[PDB]
Every structure is written in C-alpha cells, then in structure tokens.
C-alpha cells in the first residue's frame, strides 16, 4: 500500500551534514506535494520544508532557511532533506508526509536526528614557571587548555614568534567527555625577568580565542 519509509538519521555535531531520505511506494512521488515535519523529543510539531510535484517549488521554514535543502529524485521515487549548519534545536524526530486534500494523508515512521554534546569553549590556565622548576639556565612554562568541545584548538606562543622549544601536546578525552591538552615552552631562566610570554589559543568551533600571559607563581 501507500508507504513512506525514512532513513539517514543519526547523531551529528553542530554544523555537520546529514541527508535524510524518504522512499515512497504505491504512488508516484512526482505527482504529490511532499512535506517534512519534525517533532522535538517531548514537544510539538514544526513544519520543516516542502516541495511541489514536477514544478519542484521548494518551501522552507524560517528556522532552517539557508541551512536545509529539500530535493526529490523521481527515478528512485524518493524525497530528500539535506541538513547543514545543524544546531541544538535541530534535535528532533523527522517525518516525511504526503499532501492530501488540504492536509497530510500518509506518514512515515520517522527517523531521529540528534546533536552532539554541544559546543564548549576551552578554559586556559597558566602553567606557572618557578625557581624550583628552574633548572640551571632553562625554565619551563606553559598554559593549559581544559574542557573544550569539539576539536580542535590551535595553540601558538607570543603571536607565533616563539617556535623553538614550543611543545603542544595531543588532546585527551577527560571522563567528562571534554577535550583537554596543554602547550609548553622552555625558556632561558634569565628571560623570565623581562620577556613576556602569552599563549594564543583559538577555538574555531566556538569562535573563541584566548590569550593568557603566563607569569611567575606567587602567593
């Protein structure tokens, strides 16, 4: 009988890319208005997009306009929903339905689209150099990158001028599901008195850049 089957769901990070599929049987999908409707877990109904038979006039909701694309392929009798620039609100069960009279006659089973653990800007703490750490004429300082999601973070030192001795460590996954790493550089012990040292951390996911000047430990 008239049956709408949906596939392509899953979990994606904010942004990402997901193409939901909706294959039809028992009728020519090119002969009907087709709609996409989403339902947030434990919430109401929100119309997402639509397409016209043959004319292929695509209509969109204002909440997705500029991020989502609805297209149909007559050969496979299947309608599609391409999802880019995904956000937290885009987490919902997505249905595909066929327009009947002035309503939606038939409906699919729906497939879920879920967002990730959401973006999180990093926290930057100074790995303070100390006289106790100071070994001969070689002192060590750094600045820690903690609790960021997702990857990556670009760490540079003194606007990129400082390269010799810089060691940025690979990111770890803490038990809180949050990425973390650190970057350190070895400096002359004499340079501690005069040379200022700023770490340059950039988080393009969160569009956040942090610049911390590591300084001698005190009380």
């Amino acid at each position: 009988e008239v049956q709408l089957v949906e596939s392509g769901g899953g979990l994606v990070q904010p942004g990402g890319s997901l193409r939901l599929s909706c294959a039809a049987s028992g009728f020519n999908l090119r002969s009907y208005y087709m709609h996409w409707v989403r339902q947030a877990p434990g919430k109401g109904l929100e119309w997402v997009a639509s397409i016209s038979p043959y004319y292929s006039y695509t209509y969109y909701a204002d909440s997705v306009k500029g991020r989502f694309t609805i297209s149909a392929d007559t050969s496979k009798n299947t309608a599609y929903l391409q999802m880019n620039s995904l956000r937290a609100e885009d987490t919902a069960v997505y249905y595909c339905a066929r327009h009947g009279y002035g309503a939606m006659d038939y409906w699919g089973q729906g497939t879920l689209v879920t967002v990730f653990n959401q973006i999180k800007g990093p926290s930057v703490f100074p790995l303070a150099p100390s006289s106790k750490s100071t070994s001969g004429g070689t002192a060590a300082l750094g600045c820690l990158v903690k609790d960021y999601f997702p990857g990556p973070v670009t760490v540079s030192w003194n606007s990129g001028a400082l390269t010799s001795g810089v060691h940025t460590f690979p990111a770890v996954l803490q038990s809180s599901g949050l990425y973390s790493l650190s970057s350190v550089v070895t400096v002359p012990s004499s340079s501690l008195g005069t040379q200022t040292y700023i770490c340059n951390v950039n988080h393009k996911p969160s569009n956040t850049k942090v610049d911390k000047k590591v300084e001698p430990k005190s009380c």
Binding site: A103, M104, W107
Partner: protein, 211 residues
Amino acid sequence: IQMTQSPSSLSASVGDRVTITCRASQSVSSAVAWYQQKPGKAPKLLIYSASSLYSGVPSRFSGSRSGTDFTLTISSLQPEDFATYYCQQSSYSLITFGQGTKVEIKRTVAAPSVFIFPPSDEQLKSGTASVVCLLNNFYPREAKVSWYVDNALQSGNSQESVTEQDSKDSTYSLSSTLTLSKADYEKHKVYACEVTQGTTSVTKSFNRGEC
C-alpha cells in the same frame, strides 16, 4: 498564522463530550486539519477542511470553525481516544501547527495488583540478579515504589517503566526493575517491594530459599 490550541491538556472519563479549540491569529483559509498522535506513533489524519471526516475516522470526531476558532469535537469519548491532538493551518505554503492538546482518560481510582519476581535461576548463573516488581492496572498514574533488602532501603539501583494508558479500562501499569550483582543477591534473604498511593501502601515480599 499562529495556531493557538486550547487547552494544553485535559482529562475526561469514558463517554464524555470533548472539545478542543484552535484559534488562528489572523486567517481566512478554511483549510484546517486535525490529527491524532498516539504515543510513539506517527500523526494520524482525522479531519480535513475542518469539516470533512478522513476515510476511516470514527464518528465521534467532528470539526467546526468559529471564524477564527476552529474546534474539534469528540461526541462520545472512548478509552482508545487517549492521545495528543494537533491542529494544522495551510496558508501560502505556510503549514503551521498548534502547540498541542494532550487527552488523558479519567477513571475511577483503583489500586494496583502487585506481584514480585525473584531473579531466575538462569540470570543468577550469568552474574546479575534482576528483581522486578509489577504494578498492574491502577489509576491514577502516580505512585511511589521503594525497594527494601533485609529491611534496608535501596536507592539508585532501580529502573521503572510505565505503560501507556490501557485502551480498554483506562488504567496504567508499571514495572520497577531492581538490579544487583550475583554476590549481593546471595548475601541477603528478605526482598520486598513497597508501593505508596495516597493513604494506602502495599508490600509484597519473598525470602531467598522459601519454596
């Protein structure tokens, strides 16, 4: 338009006459449709053109339009009619939906029949012991299930699941699963399940070994 559905929820016993109002902010498009979304299923078309009964829809459902306040009427509420109902506008490719109206079925307050199940001989060999407490055919939905092991109250090691409202007698059903290791289950004798509704509390129990 802004489909304002009233109320957000309501409860009514079997045989009641139920009315749901959906008001369009500013529209003249008579094209308004009604749907029924049973828990965990897809929206089911009920009424289109706010007057016409979709083929296969029970008599009880009926539609109307108070100019801007399109109304859905259930003449004789059946226990199967428990669901969330939505209204839908179609302006110039402008498909807007109401916030939704949940319908629960009221019923004479009844206590649950309670059964307790010791973990099976098979599950014990695997290494995990699951003791399940059943609350059958009770109303209303809310209750308080507490687990006791040798008169020591348990916490955090239980998971409960409640059925949807029974489509015949309008009652619920709940299962509380208590999960413990094999070693823990072998280290205790008295297992009891306590359920609290209003002024009444009932406790089933079993003793490890008693046959």
